[PDB]
Amino acid sequence: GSSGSSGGKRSHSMKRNPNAPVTKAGWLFKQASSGVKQWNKRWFVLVDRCLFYYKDEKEESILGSIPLLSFRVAAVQPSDNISRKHTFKAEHAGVRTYFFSAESPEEQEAWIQAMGEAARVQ
């Protein structure tokens, strides 16, 4: 046996509430880390003004959560480095800038409606 890479302190506590209505759900493509250049199709779910992506539609357990209430979603620039079209990325101008591509232009726009708005702090 070998332990480690676990951690011994709680800094942030975020999780999809059990009694929280699903805002919007849909299969999206999450860009890979700076390392490998590729896309990884996963199940995206918006709940509690927050984004939650699961390995599959099963939604067994939240793999990673990202606060949108502190971001400004917006369609990728006309000079972005994304081959696929109808893409959208969110930036918080302090932490980082996430990206999300869409198969059709109808899904992208629709997503921005929920994400973009849910992001606003006003």
Curated annotation (Swiss-Prot):
It comes from Homo sapiens. This is Pleckstrin homology domain-containing family A member 6. Highly expressed in heart, kidney and throughout the brain. The gene is PLEKHA6. Residues 21-120 form the PH domain.
